[PDB]
Amino acid sequence: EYPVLQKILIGLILGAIVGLILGHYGYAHAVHTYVKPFGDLFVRLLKMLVMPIVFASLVVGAASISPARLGRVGVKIVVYYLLTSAFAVTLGIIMARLFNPGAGIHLAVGGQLVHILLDIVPTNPFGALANGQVLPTIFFAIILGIAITYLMNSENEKVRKSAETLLDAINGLAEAMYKIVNGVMQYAPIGVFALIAYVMAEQGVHVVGELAKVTAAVYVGLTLQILLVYFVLLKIYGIDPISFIKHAKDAMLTAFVTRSSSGTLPVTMRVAKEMGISEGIYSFTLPLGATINMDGTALYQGVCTFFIANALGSHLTVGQQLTIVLTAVLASIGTAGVPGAGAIMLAMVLHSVGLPLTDPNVAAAYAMILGIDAILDMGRTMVNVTGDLTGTAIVAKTE
Amino acid sequence: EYPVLQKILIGLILGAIVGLILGHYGYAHAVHTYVKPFGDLFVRLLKMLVMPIVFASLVVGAASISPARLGRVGVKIVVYYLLTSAFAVTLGIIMARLFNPGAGIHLAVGGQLVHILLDIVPTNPFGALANGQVLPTIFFAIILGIAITYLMNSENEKVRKSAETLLDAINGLAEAMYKIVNGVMQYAPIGVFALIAYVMAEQGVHVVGELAKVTAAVYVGLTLQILLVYFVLLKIYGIDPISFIKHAKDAMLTAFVTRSSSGTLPVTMRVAKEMGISEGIYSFTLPLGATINMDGTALYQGVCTFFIANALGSHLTVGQQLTIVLTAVLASIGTAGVPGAGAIMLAMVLHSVGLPLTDPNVAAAYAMILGIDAILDMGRTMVNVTGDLTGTAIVAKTE
Amino acid sequence: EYPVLQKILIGLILGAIVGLILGHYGYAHAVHTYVKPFGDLFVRLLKMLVMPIVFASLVVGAASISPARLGRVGVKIVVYYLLTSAFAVTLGIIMARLFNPGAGIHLAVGGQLVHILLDIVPTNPFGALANGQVLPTIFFAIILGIAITYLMNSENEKVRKSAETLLDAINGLAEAMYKIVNGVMQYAPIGVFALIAYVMAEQGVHVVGELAKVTAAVYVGLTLQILLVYFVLLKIYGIDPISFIKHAKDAMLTAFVTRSSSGTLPVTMRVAKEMGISEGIYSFTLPLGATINMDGTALYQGVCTFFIANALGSHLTVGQQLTIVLTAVLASIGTAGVPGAGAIMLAMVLHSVGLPLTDPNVAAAYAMILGIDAILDMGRTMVNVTGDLTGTAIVAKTE
Amino acid sequence: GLPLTDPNVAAAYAMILGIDAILDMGRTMVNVTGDLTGTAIVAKTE
Amino acid sequence: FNPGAGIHLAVGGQLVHILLDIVPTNPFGALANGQVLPTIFFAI
Ligand code: NA
Ligand code: NA
Ligand code: NA
């Protein structure tokens, strides 16, 4: 069309500024109703593609890889995702001591599954698809793909002819989705402009005071996470870090602007295609990654728990701090669903951190974080989306 | 089977008489529980086919036409649909002055979007399909069809092979639906018999009095609409009017008997196929037409607003009358959904006509219209369905 | 893997014993939360496959059989299913006089559709699939299959090419489900172990007393049903009874263990494939059979009505007894849906048997049956699943 | 025997609804006289 | 007066407890919520 990747940067910088201006003069609503819609439409289109592209891609990927292999890749990636997720909150806490974000806050307070695994097996695969539901889709999509392999090896040609057909056909759909992700991308500059403008209009005005301290703490945390873990692990597995960022650029910017791992999945999955990773590998991991792995979100969980505990002048035993890591890692898997999951998890860490949300001051401090949540979420997600790409590139390198 | 198109006329004439008899003797319920079901079953079958036939046909159509072309055809048709819709209410009003339907009615009364466009983009195409949802389907079906074109041009043969497959396969389904629409048609005589019998049993008994005047006004309005606009525009674009009616006959009769533009879409879409219009053209316009364009319904909206305003001896400023047109045109697009949309729109024109529905006399008059709604709706729909066919034949002629 | 069919028997015998032990010591809950889940996962997997495997298989079957033929086979099987169902309750009653199960129970009590056919026609085929809904699926699947035949006879090759494709592709999916049903089967021994263990834990402890008498009466009833009707009708149609049981063995054991006709439908449909019955025949009848025909459940309905009527010392006129048969046969078709349908039907026979459930003693006796319901349901289902297989083998023999 | 659900039956009913107070005023003044009268008569019998 | 003349429109188509209630169960409750009849009863 015109510039194109700049087009996005022009829109992002220009937007986040125009929004910050508009917001300061109390036009946040004016934006919301006039500007924000154009952003939605971007997210809309992306969502749309997810379900076919996840489904179709995985059948094909799973068909054209060995079974034990997924086994490998699965175990690898699951083990990966957890180490990065666990490590990432520890870097959050480390970032949280560096900036003391709960200083003042001159206020205080005293006071006091199997089913989930079962659910991965959809009872209606059609039903599965139809209502969002990424995980049961992943499950069935692999089962289907594997099946197909066995059908094309079958002695009967009349059989392999149907199996080939169905495969091709599914790939048709799969491929055609990658096609559309480029379409949907061309509207990305316009889309991106509206998304960040709206978020700066909403919670720009908020980054003032001790709340800037928490934001800075997160964002340095994320920047540090990328260089200390992702760049280190990329070098350590013989893949060039700076080339990676060239490739992931759209995935990463879309992730940052939408704040939806799910929503950004077709961009992320096109990036892995263009990096020339096999469908067998990314098709299984990236969608598993959208739901299982939430590194960047788990980082900010770490720093926010501190903001609140510092706020009330809570001890926060060093022994306690590691339980912050454990639960918030357990929480990210548990909140696969990204509807302000970040704030939910937070409410959760406090349910077990011992600080009841019902107590006003605990609420008060939570309230503040709520006012800054998108600003955090944008970052947290771009780190989340890099996390999977990285893992997937590493796990692909081992094959 | 037996006669066949007569079979329908025998059933229609025979039915609408038998129903009118049964009704006069208060057997309207007897009919309802014994006869009407047979009519349902006809509507049923038709419904069923819509979703696949709309979706499948459009992917193929959109695949096998130029992109800018849809652009053209879309603009053409959208512009068309509005002129015909706007014009049609003016002919309603013109018909409404001709017959004064609110004479007596010797009673009086005094007293005093973005989101929508967003919604066209489905977030789950599967979900879209599953729950009725024709528009988001139309969107995604075009997106898919276009994508496919680009896939069959791709340098990689392994690609074009999948794309071809998926295309073919979709057309298989598409074609197969046209197949079934002839099946479903063979039961049309029986189906038609029950539908009109039921409607004459229910609101035959009602066409007495000033209510006949509104009915006559509508029906002449519709007859006039066909000759003054559809026949005039057919000649004016070099297509033979009398031949058109030969072709549209089933589409038209089904439309009249069912009262669902949606429901009648497979018949209408088969009629366009048999007229030899390209799938690229009718596949996009006819389903758009089912929801956007409601000429015949908008005509009766015009005449009914008058019945009510005359009823209360309201001024109805000539300046006011044009706002009747504007809102009722804006309303037909808004109530794409045909569950007694006609009566809903009417309630809406009054919400803005200034006559509150809460006032008993305003309600009283409204009530009367309610009692005659099907009798109007049958007509109004047969005009609606001709409207799209015509538009689609004209737009096709331009290509 | 390892043994395999024994693997199932080892797990069944070992489980039903281990469960009975664990239950007697009040660990029923311990089982429920620790063991039962492994059983679920088995049912889960089987369910999943049903919808595609029913749908895909039938399109193909219906495509590749004559229309009038389904006509035949449908009529045959419908007439079959009813005779077997009617007969089976008469054998229940005959079994109920043999064992007097309402003896003591030294307690007494005195005191005092079209729509359904319409529903078979889905309005959204996609919607049909998506939400369970087997029947409207069957309907549309046949309509689709037949359609396709007509498309491959069509003069235009470009047509037959799509029709072939779509067919192939659907068969791909169909075949692939059969593939997965073997997968799902390999986990059957583990699956079966949890299912029966949980049911013995829950209602083992209950088979004590007059309740054993009803259980025995049912179970002899089912054993008798197989030999007196299924074996007799197999010989009488020239098919070897003992070979049948060899083939049906997985179908029958899965049916017994899950208690879901629906759930066991992919095993049952694989058994008919491996018996070499045509897809045209079993594809239409076995799914119809999962919902229409419930012989074994209707047998225990017959014996339970007696338990309760004996309990209160009700007359139970011999004329009354036949109305027990009629309604309980009408009830099985009516409760196609297997969520404890058996107890629902029972509540229904009493709604019309004259004994109101509201009366405590009527309830009391009902309560007892509720406590034994699974133990009965297991049996009743394994007879239900045999019922269709048999019918299907017989109707297949006539072709 | 005239069901209110039938629109025209409703329509006519609607009209009456619009005049209901005008009727109710009168209807009540006659209602209140009714008891007073009855009460005066029954009092006269004692 | 023929009041349904026109109206040029047409249409075809197709206790013990109460006595018990007079006896309030709470006279105070009776008073408190409107309730004229049970009041009359108790008052007598
Ligand atoms: Na992620
Ligand atoms: Na229309
Ligand atoms: Na069955």
Author numbering:
A (entry chain A), B (entry chain B), C (entry chain C): 9 to 120, 130 to 416
D (entry chain D): 371 to 416
E (entry chain D): 107 to 120, 130 to 159
Structure paper excerpt:
Glutamate transporters, or excitatory amino acid transporters (EAATs), reside in the plasma membranes of glial cells and neurons, where they catalyze the re-uptake of the neurotransmitters glutamate and aspartate (L-asp). Key mechanistic and structural insights into this family of transporters come from studies on an archaeal homologue from Pyrococcus horikoshii, GltPh, which symports L-asp together with three Na+ ions; however, it shows no dependence on counter-transport of K+ under the conditions tested. GltPh, like EAATs, is a homo-trimer. Each protomer consists of a central scaffolding trimerization domain and a peripheral transport domain containing the substrate and ion binding sites.
Therefore, we crystallized GltPh-R397A in the presence of 400 mM Na+, but in the absence of L-asp. The structure of the Na+-only bound GltPh-R397A shows HP2 in a conformation overall similar to that observed in the fully bound transporter, but with an opened tip. This opening is smaller than the opening observed previously in the structure of GltPh in complex with the blocker L-threo-β-benzyloxyaspartate, and it is hinged at two well-conserved glycine residues at positions 351 and 357. The Na2 site still shows a distorted geometry: the last helical turn of HP2a points away from the site due to the altered conformation of the tip of HP2. Therefore, opening of the HP2 tip upon Na+ binding in the outward-facing state may serve as a structural mechanism preventing uncoupled uptake of Na+ ions. We suggest that the structural changes in the NMD motif and HP2 that are triggered upon Na+ binding at the Na1 site may lead to the loss of direct interactions between the tip of HP2 and the rest of the transport domain, resulting in tip opening. Subsequent binding of L-asp and Na+ at the Na2 site is then required to provide compensatory interactions, allowing HP2 tip to close.
